[PDB]
Design a protein around this ligand. Sequence first.
Ligand code: AGS
Ligand code: ADP
Ligand code: MG
Ligand code: MG
Ligand code: ZN
Ligand code: ZN
Ligand code: ZN
Lengths: 204, 438, 662, 162
Amino acid sequence: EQTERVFQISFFNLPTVHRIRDIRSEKIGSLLSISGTVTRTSEVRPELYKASFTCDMCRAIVDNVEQSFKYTEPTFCPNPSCENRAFWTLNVTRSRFLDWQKVRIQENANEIPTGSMPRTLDVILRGDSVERAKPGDRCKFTGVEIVVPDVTQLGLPGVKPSSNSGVTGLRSLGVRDLTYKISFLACHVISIGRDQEVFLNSLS
Amino acid sequence: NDDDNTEIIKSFKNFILEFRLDSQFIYRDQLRNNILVKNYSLTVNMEHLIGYNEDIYKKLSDEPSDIIPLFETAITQVAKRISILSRNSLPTFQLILNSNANQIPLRDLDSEHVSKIVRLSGIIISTSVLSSRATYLSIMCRNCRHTTSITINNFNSIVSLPRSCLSKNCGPDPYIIIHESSKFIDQQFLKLQEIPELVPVGEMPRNLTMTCDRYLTNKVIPGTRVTIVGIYSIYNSKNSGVAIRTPYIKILGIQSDVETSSIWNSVTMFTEEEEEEFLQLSRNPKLYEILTNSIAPSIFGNEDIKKAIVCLLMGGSKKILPDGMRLRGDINVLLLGDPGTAKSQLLKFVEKVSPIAVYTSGKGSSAAGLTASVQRDPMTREFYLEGGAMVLADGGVVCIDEFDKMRDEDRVAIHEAMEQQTISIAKAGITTVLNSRT
Amino acid sequence: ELTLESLSNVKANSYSEWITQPNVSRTIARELKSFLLEYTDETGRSVYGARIRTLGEMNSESLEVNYRHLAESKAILALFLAKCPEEMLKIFDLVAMEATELHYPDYARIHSEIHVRISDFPTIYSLRELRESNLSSLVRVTGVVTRRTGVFPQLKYVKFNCLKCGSILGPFFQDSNEEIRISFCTNCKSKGPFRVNGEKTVYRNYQRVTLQEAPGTVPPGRLPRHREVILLADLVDVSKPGEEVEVTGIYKNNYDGNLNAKNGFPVFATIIEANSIKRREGNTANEGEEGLDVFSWTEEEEREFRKISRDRGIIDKIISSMAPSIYGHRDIKTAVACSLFGGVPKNVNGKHSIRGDINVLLLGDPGTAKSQILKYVEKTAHRAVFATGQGASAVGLTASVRKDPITKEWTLEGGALVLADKGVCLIDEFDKMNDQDRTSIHEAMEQQSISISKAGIVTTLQARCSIIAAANPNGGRYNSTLPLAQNVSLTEPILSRFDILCVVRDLVDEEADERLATFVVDSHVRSHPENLNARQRRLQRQRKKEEEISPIPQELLMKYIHYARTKIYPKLHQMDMDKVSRVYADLRRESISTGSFPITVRHLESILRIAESFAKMRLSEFVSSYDLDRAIKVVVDSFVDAQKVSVRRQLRRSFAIYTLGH
Amino acid sequence: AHALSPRTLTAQHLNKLVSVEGIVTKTSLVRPKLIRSVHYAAKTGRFHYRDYTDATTTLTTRIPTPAIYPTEDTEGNKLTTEYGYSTFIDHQRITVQEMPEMAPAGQLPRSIDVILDDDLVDKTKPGDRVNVVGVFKSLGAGGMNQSNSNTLIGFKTLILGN
DNA sequence: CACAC
DNA sequence: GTGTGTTTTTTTTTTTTTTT
Ligand SMILES: Nc1ncnc2c1ncn2[C@@H]1O[C@H](COP(=O)(O)OP(=O)(O)OP(O)(O)=S)[C@@H](O)[C@H]1O
Ligand SMILES: Nc1ncnc2c1ncn2[C@@H]1O[C@H](COP(=O)(O)OP(=O)(O)O)[C@@H](O)[C@H]1O
Ligand SMILES: [Mg+2]
Ligand SMILES: [Mg+2]
Ligand SMILES: [Zn+2]
Ligand SMILES: [Zn+2]
Ligand SMILES: [Zn+2]
């Protein structure tokens, strides 16, 4: 029952702590320590991490398929006898999954200028960092500021693109444009807002 | 398949032409009489078919949806043989079945029984308007103008336009309906509710959709208790799991007890024997006492109350003057007194005995739910009126228990209708004055 | 030829692939056959052989196999089941079908297949603690039913027919999670439209229930989570909407484009395939019990019920065991037992219907364990629904209509009395809610029906409830010198429905105080948490503590109550109408003359109802003379205690001629 | 027997001229529609007309026209749509329901859709009692298009008022 | 339906 | 050349329900 151990590196205690107002897209692909008040949290769902597909004929197994924001699947069968460019059956048992949650944070009350609406943001939590930031608790997140394109424009087997500057011209796009949305991906979060023998052992 | 179809058709034709109990060809005579009054239908009793030949009944019960159209074709051929001198344009007849099989409870209908014959009971709660299903369909080829005809069985298997020209390619959809030459029949959608005495404990009643056809359309009205013998069929509605299928019933027989739409279509559906029995009963000098004793026998005493109930159930005679205003013929009776005097029992008995009767609770009653409710159509986004409780009792009686628990804004809404026998609604752009002679 | 130890040391990398090995499959089949035929408990009988007997007899098609039994003997089978249930469900179902064939030859006619409902799963979860590691494995989550679709027939063996060339496709097994995919046709590689064959196709029942995190287990101030469970054939329509239940099943997942589009990640949506169900609504204080049905009684249990029924004095022992933790108040205990067993609802020719449920009202000073009595009743009865004071509105008691958020139409959902149908409804602080809410239950407690005529929805529900209410006398204290109506705020019609009315007075008597305080302290010491493995040792300690106070075990008393309610229909053939008629006439005579208690025909029917309950609690199918005299004495005593003390002595003197013998 | 009411208008009267009495309840907005488009070719000085037919316009069934103005002649000549010379007709769609007073006990009034065209538009308003004489025509596909093979939806039925 | 992907 | 994809809507107005 060998189980490939994936690891989740948790960075914390960065020299600087930004905020929603301090968000700048030029910091994409970098580590920050955003602190904000949690207002809304999603559920704990399993998200595909390392896909493991099987081609419909000749049964060749494609494993360790990297997954982007889309539902990407392998496009070529490694066995040069299988005609498969879009037809596969994902081996649900063999594929790797991650516990995943989408939390919603907003600007802290003290950081709000008078009259201005407090600004919100969406953060992605994975692994043990899930369910550690309940709504109402101001938490000091930390991780990477990423951007999610609109996967509807990217093209999906089940959905279609739906209808202020969008870029276009990709091979996979064709004629439609692509829009982007800033999000955070946290590797660590901290909120900043029984037998006798058990108590003795848990006591210094 | 054609040979088997011909075999079954000929067997059914022989059954029709030969079946008889004692010197009277019952089905031949019934078919002739139905043709005489332009009633192109036939009520076939199940025990008769079973007794004639068990093999035919087994073949019918195995795949009714395919056997029945052949039976209808045989009926049409028999009608042509024994109602028109050889050497047309006669519509295909509609089959009606009557059985005595065990009535399966409505909630007992399950993944099995699909495409079988099912007998059950219920109460009608909704009767949609009559739509039209095509039987003869004249069709025209789009490019090469090759006109043909299609015959539709209306028995869905589990049909579309042909996907080829059939005699240049003309496209994969080369056919258009010729409306002025096609033939159509009426179809009605009913919604049945399971019997309240048969619901599970702590369970809301289960609804079920079904479809009438032709001579079975407009046979009953909502609020009536009926029994249906039909086919438990399946259709896929595109409106939330995977491979889910909507169940329903295709009707093949109705057995009501409160007659057809209206009060026997506002006319006498009374056979001669029962009419003569009614006349004989009317000549009884002690008929008043017999009726009084027949009102709530389990309730001791209360003779004057029983006589007043008899008067109410009879009611006066409606008068319509030439000048325009009318005089109602209903009686309004209130029963006050100490609790535990079987007043609620009397109202329940009245609701039980009255041909048209709606029993309502005082607290569980709203003005919009008693006469008419303005509701927005989910699909068409349009407002429409849905009849209230007292409207369903039109031409009958409403037994309102806990009359002291009328909401003062709800009690007043009945003042017009209990006297004028009319309901005026001016809501959501709808201005109507319906009749409620209750 | 593989051993159980050979099952223990896995060879294939994944457990499911290990199970797919044919020799492993045959070995597991034979081992499960042996486990079914030979599993023996402490009493020595083979449980599963009798289970197959019952499965055949009632044609249940479902074999409820406890997880604990399979864990204790041949444990690696239970470990595999908790890890890879998907294939062994099929294999164990086939083995159960073969065993049924052994007991019941050619059982395949009645049921082609058999299912298995695994019970008592150890790892209980919640809709907040689920993680991806639980995929393709059994869980025992707990939740409240929120939505429940209809019983849809669903494709089992789809046999498509090719449109281009072919005419038959293989009977693919519909997963019931994702739509069946055909891809390139087998007859020809070209792709085209497909549709099923109506000749050879079979269907299974399908229901789409939605469990939500229970309000009890949700941390306060936090939103509750929800997950969806599919009920397959033979499992549909088992839990009503709004019911709190425990579901054991597989935690599967599938892909949908909508979720990926909404969240922007290749995330799947989880889903639960039901395997067994236990309703836990109304028995949240009944933990420590085994089996999916607590009120379920075995054949030996029914035999024990019959044996103890023939015992004389069983009525008194049952009465004393109503409130073992509550000292004294024997009349209240008797009334509670009568309402619990209840009478037979008469229905004359389908025209006249007679209520067969007993409604009891307890008026008494605070701190008299009336609330504790109601809590015991809620924990005790088969179907119990508890509501308190203003915390229950008029519509929430019986029924309410609402516009459907998804389909946009009015639909009716039952209230408290609907969920308590053919059960019991308890009303704490019956004097403290709104009178307009209190009047909404007249039809419910007398006609045993709920009529709704609102928003174009007109119907008549049925609520065969047994109303038990608790109130507080005016000013918080009961003035015995005054008539009962003056000590209450309620009217006659609400007083009339209640068959039995018990008045509790808080006096100061040194002997009574001594005994009550001693009993309470003894119970509290007995109730102290600090007061051959751990399980049966704990059970023995609990039985030791119970036998001090309970003449009959409560876990057996509740089964006996359920059995008597569902299988005893006593008849009143052996009785004397003269005594009952005279008693009713005298009751009305003393009520009209210097009296305020309403004595109506409902009250006369109450005597027969209480006699029927007395016959029920002895499992008697005919109301004996003792069952009638006891009911008459109870009724006359309840009437007398409802009168002022000034005329109470004279009324008791008049009534003494009717309670002869006791 | 052709003097009927919306309740009694059974399917047997399709393609038959009937007279129905009722109350006007809903009236759609007056909307003109094309029946004939006129185009001018500014390379030959010629006028080309194209007649447009619809199931709701002509009684006899004909191939529906895609309602596209031909901007080019057959001989590669650009055509300009000549409004004013093209032909449009006023169209309306009203709802006629039976009398509430002859509505049978326990039933609400039923309604049918009528298509007034050309002169008949705006000749009636909601709340008016009326008797219309016209053809009981049927429209729609009623499924039968592989979109609804087993689904039991019927056909669109209405009256072309004369 | 039909023009654009 | 075979087969798609739109256009495509949740307002205002009733009715109910809990608080107020
Ligand atoms: N004269 C009578 N004969 C027979 N049964 C009677 C008589 N009077 C009362 N009853 C019984 O007493 C009970 C009365 O219950 P209900 O009819 O529901 O209440 P009610 O008499 O209408 O008065 P309410 O509704 O409380 S104001 C029923 O069980 C009747 O059978
Ligand atoms: N007869 C009794 N025997 C044992 N305990 C009692 C008795 N009467 C009252 N109590 C105790 O009093 C406490 C409170 O009673 P409570 O349910 O508030 O009475 P009430 O419902 O009349 O207000 C309970 O914990 C119960 O144990
Ligand atoms: Mg009553
Ligand atoms: Mg209390
Ligand atoms: Zn391959
Ligand atoms: Zn052609
Ligand atoms: Zn093929």
